[PDB]
Design a protein around this ligand. Sequence first.
Ligand code: CLA
Ligand code: CLA
Ligand code: CLA
Ligand code: CLA
Ligand code: CLA
Ligand code: CLA
Ligand SMILES: CC(/C=C/C=C(C)/C=C/[C@@]12O[C@]1(C)C[C@@H](O)CC2(C)C)=C\C=C\C=C(C)\C=C\C=C(C)\C=C\[C@@]12O[C@]1(C)C[C@@H](O)CC2(C)C
Ligand SMILES: CC1=C(/C=C/C(C)=C/C=C/C(C)=C/C=C/C=C(C)/C=C/C=C(C)/C=C/C2=C(C)CCCC2(C)C)C(C)(C)CCC1
Ligand SMILES: CC1=C(C/C=C(\C)CCC[C@H](C)CCC[C@H](C)CCCC(C)C)C(=O)c2ccccc2C1=O
Lengths: 221, 64, 208, 74, 742, 43
Amino acid sequence: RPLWFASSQSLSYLDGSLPGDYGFDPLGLSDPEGTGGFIEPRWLAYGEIINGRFAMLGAAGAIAPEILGKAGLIPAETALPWFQTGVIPPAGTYTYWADNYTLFVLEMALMGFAEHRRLQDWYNPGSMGKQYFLGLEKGLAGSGNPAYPGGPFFNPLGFGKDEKSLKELKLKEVKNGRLAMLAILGYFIQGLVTGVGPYQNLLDHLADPVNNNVLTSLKFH
Amino acid sequence: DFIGSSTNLIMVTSTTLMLFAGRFGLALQTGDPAGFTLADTLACGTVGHIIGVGVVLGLKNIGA
Amino acid sequence: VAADPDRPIWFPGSTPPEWLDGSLPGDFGFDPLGLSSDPDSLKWNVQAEIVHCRWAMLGAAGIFIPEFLTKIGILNTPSWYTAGEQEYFTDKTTLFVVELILIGWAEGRRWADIIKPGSVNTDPVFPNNKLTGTDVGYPGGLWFDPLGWGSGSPAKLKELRTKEIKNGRLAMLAVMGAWFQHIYTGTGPIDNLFAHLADPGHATIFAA
Amino acid sequence: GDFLVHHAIALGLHTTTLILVKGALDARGSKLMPDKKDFGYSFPCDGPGRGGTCDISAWDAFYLAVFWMLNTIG
Amino acid sequence: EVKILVDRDPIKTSFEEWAKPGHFSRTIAKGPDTTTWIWNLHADAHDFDSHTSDLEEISRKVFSAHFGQLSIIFLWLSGMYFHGARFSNYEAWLSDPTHIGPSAQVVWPIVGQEILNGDVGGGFRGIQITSGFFQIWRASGITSELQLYCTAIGALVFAALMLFAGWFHYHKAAPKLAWFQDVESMLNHHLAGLLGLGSLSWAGHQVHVSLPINQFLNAGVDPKEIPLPHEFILNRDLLAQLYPSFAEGATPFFTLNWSKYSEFLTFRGGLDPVTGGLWLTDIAHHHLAIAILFLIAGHMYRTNWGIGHGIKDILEAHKGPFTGQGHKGLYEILTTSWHAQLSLNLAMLGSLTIIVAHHMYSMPPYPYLATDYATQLSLFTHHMWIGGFLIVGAAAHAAIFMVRDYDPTNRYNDLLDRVLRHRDAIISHLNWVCIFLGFHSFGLYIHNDTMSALGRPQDMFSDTAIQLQPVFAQWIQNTHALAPGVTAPGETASTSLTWGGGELVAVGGKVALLPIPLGTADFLVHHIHAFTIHVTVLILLKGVLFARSSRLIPDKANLGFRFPCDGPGRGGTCQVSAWDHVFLGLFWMYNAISVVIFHFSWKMQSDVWGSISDQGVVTHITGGNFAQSSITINGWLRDFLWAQASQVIQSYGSSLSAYGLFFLGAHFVWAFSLMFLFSGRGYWQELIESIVWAHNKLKVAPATQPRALSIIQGRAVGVTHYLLGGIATTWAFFLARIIAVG
Amino acid sequence: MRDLKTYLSVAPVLSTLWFGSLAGLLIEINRLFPDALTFPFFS
Ligand code: CLA
Ligand code: CLA
Ligand code: CLA
Ligand code: CLA
Ligand code: CLA
Ligand code: CLA
Ligand SMILES: CC(/C=C/C=C(C)/C=C/[C@@]12O[C@]1(C)C[C@@H](O)CC2(C)C)=C\C=C\C=C(C)\C=C\C=C(C)\C=C\[C@@]12O[C@]1(C)C[C@@H](O)CC2(C)C
Ligand SMILES: CC1=C(/C=C/C(C)=C/C=C/C(C)=C/C=C/C=C(C)/C=C/C=C(C)/C=C/C2=C(C)CCCC2(C)C)C(C)(C)CCC1
Ligand SMILES: CC1=C(C/C=C(\C)CCC[C@H](C)CCC[C@H](C)CCCC(C)C)C(=O)c2ccccc2C1=O
């Protein structure tokens, strides 16, 4: 298997079993020797996949108000960047249909249901299907793995008809997800140094790449 | 840093000097014939940056 | 008091504790701290839940019904919060003493009923009267249960008692909600409801 | 103030008396060292055994009583 | 090599062991046959080396105990910041800090104690604190009470986080021994990551928040008019209006054009003459340089990669000619023993606390610290005491190493053996130089006292009779005053103004650290300090070295570290234990630090502190009576003790009345301690058995048998009451003296 | 919990509970009935 910056310690336990592995564990957080708590290879792979999926949703949603907000499809007021939408009132607050904090309580309640059920499928995967949840508990079983439920509410149309296809799809998943995580880090650092949206940070580079890079923009704001 | 200046040339020369001292006769796994890791080049370039900043400001205060 | 090993619990996926077998009327396994780990502690906390529930239901009624039949079903009630400041035909410390003397009687009978399971069933004045209640916390007598609904199959009785404490738990929550509302917010509870139904967004606990 | 310092004086006299009388009556022995008459009036201790026996002799009662006496006369 | 070796659910979270006290020990987890049991329940409570034999459980216990200590300190800082937020005059103290007494505590009016809430100033009745939190907050650019409440809430949050962390790292996922023993990574992180990044982040606060806010606070701006700190982060024009170097951003930084950063990263050493503290411009540059230094220092030790010094490879490399194998083995006696590390870290942390005390008066780092003479005195005294205590504990834990964790068979060291083999030479020369110093430092005071009493003031050792000038200290003083120049250019002034060629920093009516002149009295008292330190080291080093064996007891290690004696034999062998040596070294540390803080208080009140009128004539608090009266003991009794204790005893009916109350009370507790240090257990056991007869006569015989205190416990109670009483006496005396005349 | 109550009944925890209750009692008495030197009832 490919080994991009793989330490001798790393590949003892990274035996290719995980989706999209390349031996890159120079630190050794996925070492199975002890490693209770949240630092463990199973939870670490799960957290990789989950932060990758949420980062995909982020990198799509933090710039969709700009890749098609300047294209004219979306109005101007609902086209702010990721950091002027209202997530940082110190940077800007758009007046949505509700207050900025009742939406946070909405997130907390709704994602609390979702994520606590996800956790209780992580701990004992046999649950989420033994308890009545308004009848839709049939597809929340989480068949074989926590990171990959495969239910009719998460995998309606089949893609893992063959384990080869499912493996390649999981590899593409984790790769796009790591790319989106790096993207989100780029978003945050770019809005931290430039105080401008990421698509505008792309356009200032595409217009004149020389004087618009990290080098010349080392001065902030 | 306005490449081509004295500070930038001095810094690149110091960094390359330290990297050369690392690769040939020392002073992140097998990816070089001499066993030069990512950590080794990180170290050599960081100490190159240290000596480069030192000599740059030392030429600035007295001389250049 | 029949156990239900696969009952729906407060936190699905979790293993409910050993001391909550499912026997009680409405035990969804919610005891993380272990405040009822002991048997007698559980037997006491059950009646505590029951009476907090019933007092809180009477409280929620006497708060909201006088606040619902005042804002729309027009009547005149001062409030629920500042009703203790209002004046009546008795001094404020006097009728407090009277209701203490009158409630402490019943609560002492309850204390006796909890310590000794069957001790206070005979009317001390008219011993022909009786309370036909075998279960602690559920006195099947005429003054409490004249309509005969507190008897029958233990399964129907269990579903009825969990109905009771189910209403009572959110009654407790509602009463302390009215408390924290009348503190954080100025106006009364039903006015808070109408202000929330006007704009659910810009009417909540948040003001900044 | 004379009342209070007279009671301080009484504290001092009763306490010096306590220390001295206790040493004198436990001079022959006690429960911790019943054969104290065999060691004499002035001996350092009886060792760390039996919990510890520092200043167990009647001489040491006299000792700590001289402290309390100096305090009282002061 | 290094890893995160950590095992899950080793211990169950349960109150079952709370219900069974003394569970940790075998003899204690069976019941209180006596009352001594409870004293042994607390004594051995944190003696984890005695509970278990394996170092893994001990390491987990102390790790989570450190987490509890950090929870406690976060809760303490929560209290301080909160009390500043709500019960303080800090919002008013910023307006007139040179005349408003910093107060952060108010008492409840119940029993007449509301007199303690006094006229501190600022339209506020409270207690004049002497902690210097107000000075920090002016140095942190707080300018509010909201920020303090938010800081208190965040500190409470971090306290709960540390409590959860201790619970998690003992009960849920506890690290095993390979994790603690990886000291290479621990040093690499604590140097670079705690001290490096911590100083870097504080430099960021100092540059972005403290500097711009203090540029206005010192420029006559009211705190309500100042822009908030984040407005410097959001709006760089307001930040640049005072320091234009921010308009260029980090381009001066990354291009190494640091010469255009000196508006806020300075080297102009000395004190800000508008407030008396150091230049915050210099402190930002300081913490920045310290960040660079600790960041390059925390990449020194090999952790997992081919680079870095293995500390074994450093220690084994040093092998002396006639010093033997040298430092070989030390990595194995420091990584397989918590007590050795505890002793080392305690010694250095204590001497560092003392250096903090010494550098916090002579280079006042906070604004309006030097003029808050109560804060200055109290902080010096505090940190001196903490340092003495930490050094004395370092002795105790060196001794505990030598008794328990010292093993010449497995965990051998050469240098420690060489030290044990001529320990008699060490202690003999120390016992000599202590006597020499005692004579030639205190007998000089006696000579001056006698010559002054015989009417022979021309025969004393004074600045007038017989010159004992600190020539070496005078030379260092004069060359540090004339240091700005050939030796240290680009500084614009001395690094401190405690040297003769310096100048006076007049802040308001106060004087704030003009030069300190060193005369014969300073010579005498400095040799008294060397004397007391040397005697403390005599006692403590002797306990450490002879912890295992002596000519008297050759099997002292088998008796333990903490044992009273080995009987009246051998003429008497009381206090041969190292515990008793450190129990004596506590008293000598007390005498040392007491005369140290007396020297500080008097030299400051006589030669430094005071009030300077607008004409320039500085009048000191005492009147310069140190070099003439601190040459004889009668001056310390008359001009320092008797005279300066005219504001703690006259403070009855005042706001400073709790100070006189604790003056008398600490007097009492000290004297009460003398009941324990002087007496012995046997008398009290016999008395207890008499009053136990009196109880058994009335069917009141307690089953937990009343036993007099153990001997070592009597000594512990004596030394702690003695120290508490002397120290609270001194605390009350200093605080009332220095708050009254101020 | 039985063991938590066993710990709450331990001598120091129960001592500080008892003396906190007692101290609150005497405190509120010396606030409601301050500055008291003589018992004037049936004096
Ligand atoms: C003395 C401090 C200390 C130390 C030495 C450790 C050490 C350890 N912890 Mg513990 N822990 C601590 C404090 C500490 N923790 C505190 C205070 C908490 C409560 C918040 C926890 C909660 C905790 C959990 C829940 C877990 C650990 C785990 C671990 C282990 C691996 C951690 C690792 O590799 O880093 C990994 C670190 C990261 C991936 C970075 C985390 C990112 C956060 C958000 C920021 C960290 C930076 C920090 C806050 C400073 C910035 C301040 C900010 C204001 C800018 C290791 C034994 C794990 C383990 O293996 O079990 C033992 C584990 O499951 N710890
Ligand atoms: C009056 C308070 C009260 C008391 C004494 C009980 C007692 C009991 N409950 Mg009930 N319960 C209550 C209120 C109460 N409940 C309410 C209001 C809810 C809805 C939120 C529930 C929901 C509930 C479920 C779902 C289940 C129980 C169960 C039980 C039993 C076991 C747990 C236990 O030991 O509780 C002892 C409880 C206490 C001693 C009270 C806690 C006191 C501390 C100080 C609370 C402080 C924090 C709190 C969150 C702050 C309140 C703020 C408020 C305004 C929200 C026991 C008979 C289980 C059972 O066996 O059912 C029969 C079960 O499955 N309860
Ligand atoms: C609150 C939940 C909780 C519970 C139920 C337990 C339960 C247990 N712990 Mg754990 N522990 C917890 C939280 C908890 N712990 C936390 C938060 C920490 C981090 C500090 C630890 C750290 C820890 C260690 C390191 C050890 C235990 C041990 C134990 C066992 C025995 C403890 C005992 O009897 O002493 C009960 C002790 C107390 C009740 C008091 C302790 C002092 C507290 C922590 C702080 C005091 C603050 C106070 C204000 C300071 C004094 C000043 C005052 C005069 C003003 C038991 C299984 C021991 C064990 O299993 O070994 C066999 C053990 O070695 N615990
Ligand atoms: C980093 C600091 C540190 C650490 C981690 C330790 C840790 C330890 N020390 Mg060391 N020690 C320290 C500092 C430290 N000490 C200092 C500063 C001194 C100098 C006095 C000592 C002197 C010392 C001796 C002489 C001994 C220890 C012992 C111990 C061990 C057990 C202590 C115990 O169970 O008592 C648990 C806690 C108590 C019994 C409470 C003590 C009560 C204090 C004195 C109360 C009064 C002080 C207070 C501030 C005043 C307010 C009064 C108010 C309450 C009214 C433990 C390994 C003992 C040991 O290893 O035995 C084999 C031992 O014999 N230490
Ligand atoms: C004021 C009270 C006092 C005095 C004078 C001493 C004196 C001494 N102690 Mg003690 N000590 C004391 C209180 C005192 N202690 C208390 C309260 C404790 C309780 C913890 C201790 C605990 C203690 C320990 C644990 C140690 C000492 C040590 C010392 C010696 C160090 C000084 C020395 O020899 O230099 C010279 C003598 C002096 C400075 C004493 C004053 C004498 C003056 C200057 C001149 C005397 C007159 C002259 C000889 C003419 C004689 C006239 C002729 C008619 C007789 C010395 C024997 C240490 C020791 O023995 O090693 C050095 C040691 O290890 N002491
Ligand atoms: C032993 C010596 C001593 C004595 C005799 C006193 C006496 C007094 N002090 Mg002083 N004091 C002392 C030591 C002493 N103090 C010390 C050491 C300190 C420092 C800690 C103080 C500090 C101090 C302060 C700061 C104050 C006092 C005050 C007082 C007065 C308290 C009156 C009060 O509130 O009680 C009232 C009675 C109670 C609190 C007890 C109530 C008991 C309950 C209700 C049970 C009884 C009812 C029961 C059911 C039985 C009824 C009969 C029936 C049912 C059978 C009283 C003159 C206060 C005062 O007013 O000074 C004049 C005051 O302000 N003292
Ligand atoms: C009794 C009660 C209210 C009674 C109200 C009355 C009589 C009101 C009367 C009035 O209004 C009227 C009619 C008219 C007004 O003019 C006057 C008043 C006088 C005002 C509320 C109880 C209110 C009680 C409440 C809210 C209790 C909440 C308890 C919770 C959440 C417990 C949680 C847990 O204990 C569990 C369950 C399990 C553990 O393991 C874990 C934890 C988490 C600890
Ligand atoms: C001495 C003491 C004290 C005090 C103390 C203090 C005050 C301290 C401070 C300290 C500090 C002040 C510290 C700090 C620290 C910090 C840290 C620890 C941090 C960390 C961070 C991090 C880790 C980050 C990272 C990152 C970022 C974000 C950027 C880039 C990227 C990275 C990832 C690198 C007291 C009095 C209380 C008591 C006694 C003891
Ligand atoms: C006084 C003294 C004692 C006796 C000291 C006793 C045992 C302390 C007195 C008893 C304490 C105060 C415990 C009693 C308090 C309990 C907690 C019980 C509570 C009762 C109420 C106060 C709540 C010694 O054992 C001793 C040993 C060696 C050298 C010197 C001495 C010494 O000087």
